[PDB]
Motif scaffolding. Sequence first.
Motif: not given
Length: 317
Positions: A167-168, A170-172, A174-175, A178, A190, A209-210
């Motif tokens: 999950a982290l 994926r959040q990284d 996405q961060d 953005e 970031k 993932e990026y």
Amino acid sequence: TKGGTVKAASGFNAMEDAQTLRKAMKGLGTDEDAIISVLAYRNTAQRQEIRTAYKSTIGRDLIDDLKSELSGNFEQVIVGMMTPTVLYDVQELRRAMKGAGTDEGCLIEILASRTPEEIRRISQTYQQQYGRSLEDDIRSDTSFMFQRVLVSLSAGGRDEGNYLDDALVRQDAQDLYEAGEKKWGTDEVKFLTVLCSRNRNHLLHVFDEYKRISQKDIEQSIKSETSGSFEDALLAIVKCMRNKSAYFAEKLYKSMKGLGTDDNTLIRVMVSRAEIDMLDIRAHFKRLYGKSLYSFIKGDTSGDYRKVLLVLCGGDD
Ligand SMILES: [Ca+2]
Ligand SMILES: [Ca+2]
Ligand SMILES: [Ca+2]
């Protein structure tokens, strides 16, 4: 995974080696070939044993004699080879920051590519030798987001192990995406956070993932969304996380391609990596550039300098 070109010698006799070196230097002129024949075929640890034996049995100082007898780039490579590993890095960082100029490329190379444990030893030895804080000098000679990357690397605080918090990840990613899509400037914090804090396995997952969510490699976005030494520092971290040997292969290519030669970089990389991963560097260089590392060095250097760099490289005919 193939490892280094320079290995510990078998049959190592420090008193004989000390005598060989003395005989090479005594009298008018020098036998540079004989100097290479010993020192380029001993590892750094063994070279220190030779230094001790030279003092004890020749009654002279080996480094001092080498500096008296040799000059130029050849001297720089030989004296670098004779320097203990930690101290060589310390001295390169000091040279990078001493006086008016700052060699940002050297700061990035060492601080991105060395492990936290190595950087602790460097930090402590820099302090002991110079009575200056490595961190304070970084903060005096670099600024803004670039400084923050170097300070983070100098502190050795990255997460370790290979824990995978998907999950982290994926959040990284996405961060980071953005952070690039902001209207009035990239959110560079970031990039700093993710690339300086997370463990390697985590980062390798973030890179993939990026790409999945953005259709861009993270390096492409770094190049378009950041600039200057901060950009270069981020790219070095990415490259080192993907494959450190490839990072060094690219540094060697850049030092030699086109007009003239960045000898300071070529020397530091060849000396520092000969015992670690030079065989891996060679393999990656050939894959990236379609030519042997050996052939690049042979075409870009001459004389005893070329001879010793080609032993450090290994190879090739
Ligand atoms: Ca002499
Ligand atoms: Ca400076
Ligand atoms: Ca060149």
